[PDB]
Ligand binder design. Sequence first.
Ligand SMILES: Nc1ncnc2[nH]cnc12
Ligand SMILES: Nc1ncnc2[nH]cnc12
Ligand SMILES: Nc1ncnc2[nH]cnc12
Lengths: 289, 290, 289
Amino acid sequence: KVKVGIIGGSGFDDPNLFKKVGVRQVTTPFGKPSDTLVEGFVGDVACVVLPRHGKGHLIPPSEVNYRANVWALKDLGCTHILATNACGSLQEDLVPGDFVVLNQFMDKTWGRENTFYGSKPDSLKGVLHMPMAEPFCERTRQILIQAARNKSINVYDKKTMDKSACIHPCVHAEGSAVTINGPRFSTRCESFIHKAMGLDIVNMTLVPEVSLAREAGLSYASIAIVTDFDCWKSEEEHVCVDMVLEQFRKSVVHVREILLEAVALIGAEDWTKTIEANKALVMSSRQDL
Amino acid sequence: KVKVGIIGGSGFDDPNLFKKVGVRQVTTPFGKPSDTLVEGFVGDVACVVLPRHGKGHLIPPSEVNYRANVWALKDLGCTHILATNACGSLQEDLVPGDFVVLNQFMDKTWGRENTFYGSKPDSLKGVLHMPMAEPFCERTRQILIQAARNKSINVYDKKTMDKSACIHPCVHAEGSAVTINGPRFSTRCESFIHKAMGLDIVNMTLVPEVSLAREAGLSYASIAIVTDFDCWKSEEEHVCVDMVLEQFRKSVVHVREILLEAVALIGAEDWTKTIEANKALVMSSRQDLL
Amino acid sequence: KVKVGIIGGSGFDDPNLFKKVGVRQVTTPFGKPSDTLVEGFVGDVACVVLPRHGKGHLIPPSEVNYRANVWALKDLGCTHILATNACGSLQEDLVPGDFVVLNQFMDKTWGRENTFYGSKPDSLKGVLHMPMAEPFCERTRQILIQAARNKSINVYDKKTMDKSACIHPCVHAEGSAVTINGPRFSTRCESFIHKAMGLDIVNMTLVPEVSLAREAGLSYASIAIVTDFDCWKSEEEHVCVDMVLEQFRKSVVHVREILLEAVALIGAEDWTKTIEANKALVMSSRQDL
Ligand SMILES: Nc1ncnc2[nH]cnc12
Ligand SMILES: Nc1ncnc2[nH]cnc12
Ligand SMILES: Nc1ncnc2[nH]cnc12
């Protein structure tokens, strides 16, 4: 029994992926979600849509209640979460218009509530140390990639394909993301430092959303939308809000295609053991037990 | 017309740049500034002076209300902000006594209020994503450098001069700064890591002051005072409070000379377009309005 | 007169080093310590034991009241603190079972109270900028190392020895630690990034414990217990709670042996000048004065 939650970020404040059947305003032990949750179906698969920054985009990346958002989806019966993340490219072969199915990240966030467990009154009791070597649900990752293939969107795998075979616009089959706290964009100094470390893209919204999803025993995968080259290139042109929004509008049609096709693909498989494994991993990470 | 705000940090708790014409204690949407603001004139140019840590230096770098300080300067009508920052050198050619007109930074601060905008009652409403590729006002940067030339202080530009032209004490025409949260100084491990990343100096007070200045639509430039070699050199001697204060007292006369001349140079030019551009950049970065 | 406090972390919530002669529950100007402080003797040397995470390990690394723990030990009259820290290795020469007498660290923590001094009501008045070039008490470090020698445990000093002399299990005479906030473990991306920076181990509990100890004028030394290779090696296996606890159980007998000998060796020497130097360093770091 699968149900897919969808979290839309920058340039995707109103995903609008289906005819809305119902609307839930929920509360969690960790506070209220960013907005009301919109429910509907993709085929026979139940689906929930939630704007990360609220309908009017009034909530900045660092102030988003990631716990409430993830836990609200969990309470509504979601087994999977597909998320969108606008980003800047730190590499030549990743160009505006491309998408990246992330498989790795580096965390530079702070001051965000990043765990459901702890000793404070507003947390679940216990100490939870989750393994995060491969922080995403690999099965869900491959579904996003396969969804791109089915909708005739180019896929580039750096490990099996030459760079001359990278056909833009394309969905990159892997990549690492540095997550900064924001709300400001990076300096040129920080950009080149991130490049030197071999990172692929830079964003503000991936962490702790990906971490909390695993804590919730949910299968999570991110589709990163490349909207710019950050600021490591020429003055014409470095990243700004207008640039991010402009490119995202150009790419949003392919984003909806991939997501809708992904939800259908997830509902076409059995996830019994994977869900078992997701829950068992959480229990085995409790050190207080 | 222009009005230049001046913020003094470590070793500069009492700038004393002029005779006070007025004295102001203001409230701000983000709290109280570090201390009373001092109003006056440098020649015919209006100025406002504000110590970053208070006159008694009781407020540590991580607890300074950068929001209130910058916003207070904005409300009083400041168009520019000149700021001083004590720092340790991570490079051979930057030695104690030198100064750096920074052009870049890397942020390693945390737990500081770094933006005026958000969804909390403690902030203005909206979501602001400012560009920070070149985080300083370039025109104001060049004025600091020119001010040093006018006061017969050596100026070293690594991009146009050979290393032989690096004569100390000198003002470096460019440089990057890593801003650590403090209050402790860095370990040797951290020092060499910052050094390997290619950073020029390390400080505790630059960020988020520079970021907030741009958010407020102000032209901001920093002059960093190199007081030590951090701790990547010999045990005699590694950075400590006494070392920092000792060098800063030796360097404070050149600092005041540069600032006063810079204020005069600012008042000699027209800034209508730059100020317009600064303000328009704010509104164009409001994603909630877009 | 010396008094050695011992802070036990992961895999060492119950050090059990001596017969309980007394117990203190205290309230400190910065709040309550993690647990009751147990008092006794190692030979003729006064000793105090305090579990960093509480007896039931209910307090996560980021929520530990390091200020209260250190200050409570200071108020009992402790002159020294010996601490244990579970960690993952980032380098080939450091394998599970090895111990490391740390001499350096890189801080990547956030949201932790890392100083006793400030302008907030819950802090001591003043501005304290402590030198931290070599953050540990060197005399106390050498005692930990000598304690290992006394117990016929291999000691590997990479500065005076060859790579062929690195015989496992061994106590490394030096090492650098990156301290992450947790509670999650690192991603492979982060693991390789830390590795490329030349760091030896990764942990969650060293900072700000070491920093506050120096602020309090106490001699502090950490012995790190390598329980895994983090996640930069083979998929079978990467770090998890079960792996950490399993290896620590295999090492705990030797950890206790070293600590007991260390406490005795401390009490056998005169620390009058060192103690004065510890106090003087704090006073010289007050910028407000
Ligand atoms: N360059 C960038 N940095 C951070 N977040 C972004 N979102 C889109 N582009 C971005
Ligand atoms: N080495 C240093 N690190 C941080 N802040 C400083 N201020 C002066 N010297 C410094
Ligand atoms: N790999 C690891 N990372 C962080 N803390 C740890 N404690 C034990 N192993 C660890």
